[PDB]
């Protein structure tokens, strides 16, 4: 098949032609390797200038895991609104598990180039060397493009911001909290431009989970070692509420764990009566059985609107 050229992908002003890209990428159509490198590195250079902790005003549509499922990413934008007039925040895990990981990366990076101030991308735990080597992304890059393209993606992933402060009310992360993250400044002071370490605050942001019995803890341990992930922690409901109160926040919005309906709202804060934690998951998943359903979160006009799709 035809490999798209730079003139076919970019207009004379340097704007990516994302409708052309969308139609070609869903057929697993490839770009010229130099053009893919241009998309990845231009997007990376934009991400690199962003803060560890993004400042994102409402209105915004918040999205969880994609995992290379390009057809569901296309549906998500239909449900959530066109990026041409909709602000977006993605919470990571763009690659692995699904079949179209490099296509999702190239399309989202193109959208970031086109809408640098209204479409935002965070890092998930899969956006790293260790996991893309263990799953399929590293092999797919080498096959369809080259190791140079894989290396460029790894460097670009290093540039992904770690978190977002949304409407000065919500902390948004892929995974969750850390025993070493007690204030928002704790996130701001991190060096994110690296492979995520095996332990520590950057690891925990990307990897941690609420306890299985979140909201009905038998003990008082805020963070316990995470036996599902084999790294990082489970965080408790008192752990979350204490973080929220200390930092004058309403809730934590995160992704990272698939849910039956595409979302879950956990136990409400005893102070505000608002769910202390919300998980959003924005593409299908294969855990026990296949589950096509997914959801996005649209925060607008002081209404938290959870929109399910893919029924």
């Amino acid at each position: 098949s035809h490999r798209l050229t730079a003139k076919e992908v970019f207009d004379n002003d340097g704007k990516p032609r994302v409708d052309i890209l969308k139609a070609h990428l869903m057929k697993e159509g490839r770009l010229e390797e130099s053009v893919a490198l241009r998309i990845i590195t231009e997007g990376a250079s934009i991400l690199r200038q962003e803060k560890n902790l993004l400042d994102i005003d409402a209105p915004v549509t918040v999205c969880g895991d994609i995992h290379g499922q390009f057809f569901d990413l296309m549906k998500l934008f239909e449900v959530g609104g066109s990026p041409a007039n909709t602000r977006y925040l993605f919470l990571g895990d763009y690659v692995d598990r699904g079949y179209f990981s490099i296509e999702c990366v190239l399309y989202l990076w193109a959208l970031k180039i086109l809408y640098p101030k209204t479409l935002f991308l965070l890092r998930g735990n899969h956006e790293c060397r260790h996991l893309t080597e263990y799953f399929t992304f590293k092999q797919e890059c080498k096959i369809k493009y080259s190791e140079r393209v894989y290396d460029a993606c790894m460097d670009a992933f290093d540039c992904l911001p770690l978190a977002a402060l949304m409407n000065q009310q919500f902390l948004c992360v892929h995974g969750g909290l850390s025993p070493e993250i007690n204030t928002l400044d704790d996130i701001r002071k991190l060096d994110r431009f690296k492979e995520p370490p095996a332990y520590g605050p950057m690891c925990d942001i990307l990897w941690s989970d609420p306890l299985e019995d979140f909201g009905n803890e038998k003990t008082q341990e805020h963070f316990t070692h995470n036996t599902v992930r084999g790294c990082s922690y489970f965080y408790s409901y008192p752990a979350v509420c204490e973080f929220l109160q200390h930092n004058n926040l309403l809730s934590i919005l995160r992704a990272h764990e698939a849910q039956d309906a595409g979302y879950r709202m956990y136990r409400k804060s005893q102070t505000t009566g608002f769910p202390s934690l919300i998980t959003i998951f924005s593409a299908p998943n294969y855990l026990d059985v296949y589950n096509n359903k997914a959801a996005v979160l649209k925060y607008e006009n002081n209404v938290m609107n959870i929109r399910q799709f893919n029924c």
């Binding site: 009310q169 309403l250 309906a261 709202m265 505000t272 009566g273 608002f274 769910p275 359903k293 925060y299 002081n302 209404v303 938290m304 609107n305 959870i306 929109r307 399910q308 799709f309 893919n310 029924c311």
Partner: peptide, 9 residues
């Protein structure tokens, strides 16, 4: 405090 609206399909 915002309200929550769930839209299911």
């Amino acid at each position: 405090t915002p309200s929550v609206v769930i839209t299911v399909c």
